[PDB]
Design a protein around this ligand. Structure first.
Ligand SMILES: [Mg+2]
Ligand SMILES: [Mg+2]
Ligand SMILES: [Mg+2]
Ligand SMILES: [Mg+2]
Ligand SMILES: [Mg+2]
Ligand SMILES: [Mg+2]
Ligand SMILES: [Mg+2]
Ligand SMILES: [Mg+2]
Ligand SMILES: [Mg+2]
Ligand SMILES: [Mg+2]
Ligand SMILES: [Mg+2]
Ligand SMILES: [Mg+2]
Ligand SMILES: [Mg+2]
Ligand SMILES: [Mg+2]
Ligand SMILES: [Mg+2]
Ligand SMILES: [Mg+2]
Ligand SMILES: [Mg+2]
Ligand SMILES: [Mg+2]
Ligand SMILES: [Mg+2]
Ligand SMILES: [Mg+2]
Ligand SMILES: [Mg+2]
Ligand SMILES: [Mg+2]
Ligand SMILES: [Mg+2]
Ligand SMILES: [Mg+2]
Ligand SMILES: [Mg+2]
Ligand SMILES: [Mg+2]
Ligand SMILES: [Mg+2]
Ligand SMILES: [Mg+2]
Ligand SMILES: [Mg+2]
Ligand SMILES: [Mg+2]
Ligand SMILES: [Mg+2]
Ligand SMILES: [Zn+2]
Lengths: 37, 192, 126, 136, 176
RNA sequence: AUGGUUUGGCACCUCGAUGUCGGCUCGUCGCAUCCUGGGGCUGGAGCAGGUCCCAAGGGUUGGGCUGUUCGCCCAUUAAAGC
RNA sequence: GGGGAUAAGCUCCGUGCGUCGAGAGGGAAACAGCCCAGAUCGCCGGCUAAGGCCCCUAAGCGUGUGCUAAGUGGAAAAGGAUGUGCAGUCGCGAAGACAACCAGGAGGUUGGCUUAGAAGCAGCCACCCUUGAAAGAGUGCGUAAUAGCUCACUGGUCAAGUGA
């Protein structure tokens, strides 16, 4: 769960979504999963 | 080559100085002055939005007609004051001109083509000075490059120009220079 | 594709129709690029085959009394033209479809009136 | 590692930075360039790093410029010396920058790659900056 | 929003009675009741159609129109025919059966694992390692699906553990 | 960028007195967590790891050497925290 | 402005600067130096500056128009993000757009070097050509290399906004 302040879609498939203010990005490739903060 | 007038309304500014100028600029109107042989220079406001839009749509140069309380004047843009940060226009100058007169214009030039592996692209000059008619103001210039090698210094006066324009700039000026591409050794040599 | 491109395509189809005598529309679905390739080669003797847009062909059909196929292009549409004779392309497509099992003929145009699938099969036998 | 090779004197007073950058406020030479926003120092190390970032990615095509040049010296008294006892020694050279100045200038075919390289240059720079083209 | 703008059709063998903000759906498969957000309204189309109404064009209505419409479509589908969710277990020593309302599992844990079925949901085991879940409310069906999925940890290497039907697992192999 | 802990700068409080390092006893708090607790990812087969997130409830060696703090060494524990 | 690091409540200068010193009053909770303003004395009078008007605490839980969901207000940056409001644009779009749900998405062609090996996918070059309807010397995850899964463009149903 790579945690950091700069979050960006890695491949053309990641998705960036919001949840209780903590913007996180999700993808089928599990490695991509990263939140902001 | 002929263009189309870009009609735009304008009003005579009421107050002159930093006060009125900055107030209008905040409003969204850029102060403007026009002058020429008419022996009657006077000063007006513009619309920032339409102004910038027309600037973009017609390039650095464009020939315009202005609306002054119903009066229609023909003028060509000469100088400008672009905001260093904001990307907005502070001041433009419209110089009255009639049909059938000679003016001096600086025209930009664009480059396109195919480059060889041993070809290095470099642009010493992006603009050149040319004389033309009021209705014959262009907005871009193009040059074709194909299969150039080693030293391929392209002369500005060597370019082919449409009719009705004379090359004000002396032929000693160079427009496009192609030199030998650098390698790792040169890259490390430079900068130290 | 641009609007100019659409106009050009509609004009091209209009000239082809005016130069043609009979035509048929089928469904290209379920056919490999290969089988399309050999069908095109085989029909390259007299027939000309291509793909057209449903709505563009619908608008281009208003020029002639070929509106019978408007209610018929619904779904993927393949256009067939018979430059040489008429039954050549019909029989060719019928046998290709029967061999593939992936080609379904939706209809055809002849004598200015739309006819059924069985009638088209009978005409192709003719 | 840009550095003036000789000056009248090796140290200079503190600066005044007030004022809008007038020199070179418009791109001229190439076809694309950066433009800073806020007053700030720019070290020779920063300039060289940005130059490396631009150059190494651009690789073969195009050639760059550097409208600025760090000239004014600076000093910092070594640790463990009670302040006083005269000026310190010079450590690095810096080039000043004002809002609206253009930092780097590029002439490469493609706008996308020019933008990408200049964006990395921005990220490596110490102050805000943004792309700008030749047009009026 | 415009998803919920479409009219939801009511099947013949379906009964719907609505009072206030609450609505209920009756059918051969059971009855479901839910309360929707107050700001958004809804009307019962005379033509056997469902039309959800948003009093405004702003955040709440724009968001909740389609939400309520889809929820009602889902609950009507469940009360008319329902839903199913098969689950197969791949691996050794994985015994799964159904004994009454409860479920007894063999997931390799040293202690037997029992899962209690919420009301209104029906189960049936068809294969030693393959079975399905038949239920009326998509909410409960999915909830139970996830609950009994999570009784085993993720498995990338062998893919062992309970998984859904259309679910596929990434492949990974280590050298040493 | 953060903290104010190390080396530092200033001399604003105290020279009609603010006792200084270690050790002993006693502790108390924060959490940037040492173990114990819960998670994400692995270049996570498993065991055993690495890394980041939540978490301060509790616990967190003894000796030889030197005044030592520190540190090395010996040998334990889940750990021998800052 | 010099020095210091544009740090110090730092130091050194200039201010026909200001204030404290040598100044009470009100405001910023507290706070000489910041803001308002000069206390002759008394009055159980009135008007006001700064700052305030829900209660502690005197004064509108005021008027009208908008923004915010963060207790931001009531500590902070580089950078990041389909938060949200405004304006100007532009591209495509009933010749049916974008997203979905169907089909194709190849033959020279394994393109040449390189490699054991390069076959669309270590790597260098045109990045050519052909049926076209679309195949990109192929954006990836795929295999030792093959071969498959995709995908880009293209065609079908649905039927207006959709992208930067
Ligand atoms: Mg200064
Ligand atoms: Mg000075
Ligand atoms: Mg910077
Ligand atoms: Mg002192
Ligand atoms: Mg004192
Ligand atoms: Mg004393
Ligand atoms: Mg004493
Ligand atoms: Mg003491
Ligand atoms: Mg002491
Ligand atoms: Mg923590
Ligand atoms: Mg753990
Ligand atoms: Mg780890
Ligand atoms: Mg802790
Ligand atoms: Mg406790
Ligand atoms: Mg000062
Ligand atoms: Mg002093
Ligand atoms: Mg006084
Ligand atoms: Mg006072
Ligand atoms: Mg007070
Ligand atoms: Mg007095
Ligand atoms: Mg009180
Ligand atoms: Mg009160
Ligand atoms: Mg009020
Ligand atoms: Mg009120
Ligand atoms: Mg209002
Ligand atoms: Mg705050
Ligand atoms: Mg912030
Ligand atoms: Mg940004
Ligand atoms: Mg395709
Ligand atoms: Mg290769
Ligand atoms: Mg080829
Ligand atoms: Zn991804």
């Amino acid at each position: 769960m790579k945690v950091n302040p700069s979050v960006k879609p890695i491949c053309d498939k990641c998705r960036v979504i919001r949840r209780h203010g903590r913007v996180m990005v999700i993808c089928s490739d599990p490695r991509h999963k990263q939140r902001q903060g | 080559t002929a263009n189309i007038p870009n009609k735009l309304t304008a009003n005579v500014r009421t107050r002159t100085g930093k006060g009125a100028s900055r107030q209008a600029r905040r409003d969204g109107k850029v102060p403007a002055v026009l002058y020429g042989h008419g022996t009657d220079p006077q000063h007006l406001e513009l619309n920032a939005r339409d102004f910038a839009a027309v600037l973009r749509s017609h390039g650095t140069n464009a020939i315009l007609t202005l609306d002054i309380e119903g009066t229609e004047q023909l003028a060509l843009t000469k100088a400008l004051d672009v905001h260093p940060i904001r990307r907005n226009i502070q001041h433009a100058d419209l110089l009255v001109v009639q049909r059938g007169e000679k003016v001096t214009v600086e025209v930009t030039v664009l480059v396109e083509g195919d480059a060889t592996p041993g070809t290095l692209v470099t642009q010493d000059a992006n603009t050149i000075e040319i004389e033309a008619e009021a209705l014959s103001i262009p907005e871009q210039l193009t040059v074709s490059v194909e299969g150039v090698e080693a030293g391929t210094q392209i002369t500005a006066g060597q370019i082919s120009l449409p009719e009705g324009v004379n090359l004000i700039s002396d032929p000693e000026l160079l427009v496009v220079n192609v030199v030998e591409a650098p390698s790792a050794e040169a890259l490390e040599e430079e900068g130290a | 594709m641009a609007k100019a491109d659409k106009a050009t395509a509609v004009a091209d189809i209009a000239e082809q129709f005016k130069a043609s005598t009979a035509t048929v529309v089928t469904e290209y679905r379920g056919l490999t690029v290969a089988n399309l390739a050999e069908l095109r080669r085989a029909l390259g003797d007299s027939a000309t085959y291509t793909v057209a847009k449903n709505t563009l062909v619908k608008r281009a059909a208003s020029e002639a009394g070929i509106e019978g196929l408007d209610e018929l292009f619904a779904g993927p549409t393949a256009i067939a033209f018979v430059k040489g004779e008429a039954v050549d392309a019909a029989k060719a497509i019928k046998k290709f479809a029967k061999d593939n099992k992936a080609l379904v003929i939706k209809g055809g145009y002849m004598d200015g009136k739309a006819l059924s699938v069985a009638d088209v099969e009978k005409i192709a036998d003719l | 590692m840009l550095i003036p090779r000789k000056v009248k004197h090796r140290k200079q007073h503190h600066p005044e930075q007030r004022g809008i950058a007038s020199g070179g406020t418009s791109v001229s030479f190439g076809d694309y360039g950066i433009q800073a926003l806020e007053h700030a120092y720019i070290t020779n190390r920063q300039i060289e790093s940005a130059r490396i970032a631009i150059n190494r990615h651009i690789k073969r095509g195009g050639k760059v410029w550097i409208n600025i040049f760090p000239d004014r010296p600076l000093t910092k008294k070594p640790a463990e010396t009670r302040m006083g006892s005269g000026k310190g020694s010079p450590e690095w050279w810096v080039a000043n920058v004002k809002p609206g100045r253009v930092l780097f200038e590029l002439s490469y075919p493609d706008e996308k790659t020019a933008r990408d390289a200049l964006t990395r240059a921005i990220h490596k720079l110490p102050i805000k900056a943004r792309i700008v083209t030749r047009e009026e | 929003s415009r998803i919920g703008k479409q009219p939801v059709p009511v099947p013949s063998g379906v009964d719907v009675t609505i009072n206030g903000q609450n609505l209920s759906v009756k059918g051969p498969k059971g009855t479901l009741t839910l309360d929707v957000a107050e700001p958004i309204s809804v009307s019962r189309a005379e033509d056997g159609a469902i039309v959800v109404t948003r009093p405004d064009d702003e955040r709440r209505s724009r968001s909740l129109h389609g939400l309520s419409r889809t929820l009602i479509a889902n609950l009507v589908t469940g009360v008319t025919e329902g839903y199913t969710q098969k689950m197969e277990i791949f691996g050794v020593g994985y015994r799964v059966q159904l004994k009454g309302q409860n479920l007894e599992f063999a997931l390799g844990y040293s202690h037997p694992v029992l899962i209690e079925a919420p009301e209104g949901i029906t189960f049936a085991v068809e294969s030693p390692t393959k079975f399905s879940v038949s239920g009326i409310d998509k909410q409960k069906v999915g909830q139970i699906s996830a609950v009994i999925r999570r009784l085993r940890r993720p498995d990338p290497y062998k893919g062992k553990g309970v998984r859904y039907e259309g679910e596929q697992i990434r492949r990974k192999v280590g050298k040493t």
